[PDB]
Amino acid sequence: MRNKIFISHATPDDNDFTRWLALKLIGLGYEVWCDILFLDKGVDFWSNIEKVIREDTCKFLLVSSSYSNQREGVLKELAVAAKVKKQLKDDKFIIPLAIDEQLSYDDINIDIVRLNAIDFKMSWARGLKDILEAFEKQKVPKEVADASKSNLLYQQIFLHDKSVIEKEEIYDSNWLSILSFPEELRFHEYNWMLPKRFDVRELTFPAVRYKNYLCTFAWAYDFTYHLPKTETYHKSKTIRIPTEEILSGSYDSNFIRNAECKRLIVQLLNKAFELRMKDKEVQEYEMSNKTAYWLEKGKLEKDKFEKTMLVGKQKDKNWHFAISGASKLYPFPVLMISSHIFFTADGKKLIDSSSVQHSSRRRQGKNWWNNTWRTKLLAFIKYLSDDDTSFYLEMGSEEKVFVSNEPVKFKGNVSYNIPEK
């Protein structure tokens, strides 16, 4: 018995309305046939089209758009439709559905001009109501409406190739793990023998002020040259605290709180990173709250490290990849590197216009994707390496912290498929 309602159209341009009406009608209680409903293909498609048109189809709507007016498939289906129309003696077997305004009345195919066209050009809902009225008048058998079948069909035909798959992936971050730390942190006895109002930050080996004492990663007698006034220090008044136990966080004494000690270590690491990259002949740019370091044009050959394009040109400007440093603990000891893009004109002198710099940063970064950022960050990390495995960061005369040059890897269990287009 004939219950299937055929839709003919040109593909893939007319897929939108075809999908809409088919889904609404198949959720309304009817049964609809069209090319894009199955996604199986291969079973002698023309013979199947003949079989459904001649044997199973009840009504036939042709999308009388500009493209579908004379396409070979549409014309062939229309010829078979005329044959079966003469067979079943149904004058209203063919229903045109004009879906555009640019098709002139003279242009429409001769075989469909005579038949009454149900309007779909002004509004789709009124056209759907007209079609529903036509189907009530022509008394097509049907059951109750059910949109869950529409949901299932949309999920299984059109939400098929864009799902979540269980695939392993390896992601690279921008964090450097600290391998080893000095054995002990030393607090000295000063501020009665250094001059008052002293800026210890300008000293070579970094140090910080803690009320009476002086907190630094250095022995007692390494500051003689900077402060000749302090040569009288006796090496028996330096309190030493293991660093590994601070990392464990189990220290607790009236002298220092654990959080304050960790903050002092963070400041020391920040300063040490600052001077260590000062030694590596990279230019500095003082941002609003941090300092970012970049490479001058021509510092490295072809402005490239290995196979990464670090310094480039955009229009009448030169853009540089720059990095800024910071430290943190208690995920585990970590150093962060933050990426930035800066601009110049002559290759050495920065542009003093902040708004122009921001606009150029936006314009250049709009065309940078994940692979570019990852490769540039990896190349800049590798440029600072002293060994093949890690690079040292100075703590004192005989104290260093060795930071690995490979960021921490992350393992993911869910992935997708790269789109064809």
Partner: protein
């Protein structure tokens, strides 16, 4: 290496009891949750503005496709998707002569001219609402471009047109939508080069989708509410704003945005006081204001539902100190569980895929510990085959600052809270809705410092 867990995308409920993961497809396929008879429209502006609004209203009825039909699905038409009659006939029009606009457009003092233009709109709005026996749904204020160009800061009340306009009607409860002439008629408006100022030829369908969703919501209907729900759970978001005009630098104002299942939130206004510390730059409340705000929150919840909530979440951008939290805990009934979470975007951890130019999939999370974790809410998605943001995403830092709650449930809850934004029918947003509108609400409520209003629905603010 470190392992990443996966959090599945939540589903939102739609018409006929069906659930979808994208709101646009569900709307175009099933329809909105609650349907109205039709939209009774009111427009105030010049005659040309009325003509432009009428033309656009007739235009959005026709189907309108987009260049990339897989990322930005097509718009069948307002009657087709929302099943409501938003027609260009039978609308109430109020006329503003160009001479009146020119009378106040040429004033030197920016604050003064902003005040006069706002009042010139507001008096007409209130007179039309009061004198007429007609019951208009929403008021569409179509404004010429020159006013917006000349009603912005640096061009005792704020110097922005949108914020002032939304603030002054807070006491009258009048839903208003502000449009420029250049947006509704982008094709007509051209530069000296002959090109349009605003090129919407590529995202016309998405623009119509957003406008239709906003108009349907502000008229009274609910487009969508999320499907997989925990019963009796409320969300609270705190907002602080330093008042610039105040002589004392420490004066600050607080507000609480309250959300339920439905995504139609309420706004509670707090008392202005010294909440800002200029030393370390963090905001904190005195005990009395905290008690008042929380008491109003659960009073509103009891009024809306009838029973005390089983759980309460207080999302904020900064950690809570002890006196604030014990003041908060003073008021809450003992049968309810309180959680206080902090969400901040300032943690610079970026994950890079080893192969392919695409970024990390959205939804992956790295749980640091049972109290703190990351969450990638703005990563890549396969549904539309394009990530939501450019460059490389920065994840949200979710740390349970106070109270005891499972971190995984909090992660799923915060991910679910990203699908409720009626102002834009988009796939998702990178910030939870409880904190997405912090700046807009704060500026709007600061624009008027004499605001003494009861709790109001969200549509009166946005």
């Amino acid at each position: 290496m470190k392992e990443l867990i996966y959090i599945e995308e939540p589903k939102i409920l739609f018409a006929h009891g069906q659930k979808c993961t994208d709101a646009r497809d569900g709307l175009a396929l099933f329809g909105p949750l609650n349907n109205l008879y039709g939209i009774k429209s009111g427009v105030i502006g010049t005659k040309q503005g009325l003509k432009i609004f009428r033309d656009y209203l007739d235009h959005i009825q026709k189907p309108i496709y987009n260049s990339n039909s897989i990322t930005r699905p097509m718009f069948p038409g307002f009657e087709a998707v929302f099943d409501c009659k938003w027609e260009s006939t039978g609308i109430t029009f109020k006329e503003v002569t160009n001479e009146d606009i020119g009378k106040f457009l040429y004033n030197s003092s920016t604050h003064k001219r902003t005040y006069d233009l706002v009042s010139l709109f507001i008096d007409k709005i209130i007179s039309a609402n009061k004198n007429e026996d007609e019951n208009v749904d929403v008021w569409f204020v179509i404004v010429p471009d020159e006013i917006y160009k000349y009603c912005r800061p640096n061009s005792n009340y704020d110097a922005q047109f949108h914020d002032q306009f939304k603030a002054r009607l807070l006491k009258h409860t009048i839903p208003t939508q502000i449009f420029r002439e250049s947006t509704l008629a982008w094709r007509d408006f051209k530069n000296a080069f002959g090109l349009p100022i605003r090129d919407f030829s590529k995202i016309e369908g998405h623009l119509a989708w957003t406008i239709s969703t906003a108009a349907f919501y502000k008229a009274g209907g609910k487009p969508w509410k999320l499907s997989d729900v925990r019963n009796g759970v409320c969300y609270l978001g705190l907002v602080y704003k330093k008042v610039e005009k105040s002589k004392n630098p420490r004066n600050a104002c607080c507000a609480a945005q309250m959300f339920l299942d439905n995504g139609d939130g309420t706004v509670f206004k707090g008392e202005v006081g010294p909440w800002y510390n200029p030393k370390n730059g963090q905001y904190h409340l005195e005990p009395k204001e905290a008690k008042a705000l929380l008491s109003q929150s659960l009073q509103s919840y009891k009024e809306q539902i009838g029973e005390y909530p089983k759980e309460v979440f207080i999302h904020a951008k900064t950690r809570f100190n002890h006196q604030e939290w014990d003041a908060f805990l003073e008021v809450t009934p003992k049968e309810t569980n309180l959680v206080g979470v902090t969400i901040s975007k300032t943690k610079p951890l970026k994950l890079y895929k080893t192969e392919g130019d695409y970024t990390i999939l959205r939804g992956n999370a790295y749980v640091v510990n049972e109290r703190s974790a990351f969450l990638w809410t703005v990563g890549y998605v396969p549904k539309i085959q394009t990530a939501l943001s450019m460059e490389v995403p920065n994840p949200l830092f979710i740390e349970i600052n106070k109270g005891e709650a499972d971190i995984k449930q909090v992660l799923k809850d915060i991910l679910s809270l990203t699908k409720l934004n009626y102002n834009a029918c988009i796939f998702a947003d990178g910030e939870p809705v409880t904190l997405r509108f912090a700046d807009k609400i704060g500026e709007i409520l600061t624009a008027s410092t004499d605001i003494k209003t009861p709790p109001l629905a969200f549509k009166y603010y946005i």
